[PDB]
């Protein structure tokens, strides 16, 4: 079967943080909004 590259060239707008593609740059940005942060770690001490 197939594993890896898509075939017809991957999309230029593909999130790496989680792994989500989008058929619209602007869209990707909106998605990245829930990825960027201010700390290198994820404190969940409530």
Binding site for Zn ion (CB under 5 A): 15, 17-18, 20
Residue number with CB closer to Zn ion (8 or 18): 18
SS3 readout for 1-46: CCCCCCCCCCCCCECCCCCCECCCHHHHHHHHCCCCCCCCCCCCCC
CB 2 to Zn ion: min, Å: 23
CB 22 to Zn ion: min, Å: 10
Residue number with CB closer to Zn ion (13 or 20): 20
């Amino acid at each position: 079967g197939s594993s890896g590259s898509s075939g017809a060239g991957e999309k230029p707008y593909g999130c790496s943080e989680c792994g989500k593609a989008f058929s619209s740059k602007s869209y990707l940005i909106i998605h990245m909004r829930t990825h960027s942060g201010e700390k290198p770690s994820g404190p969940s001490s409530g």
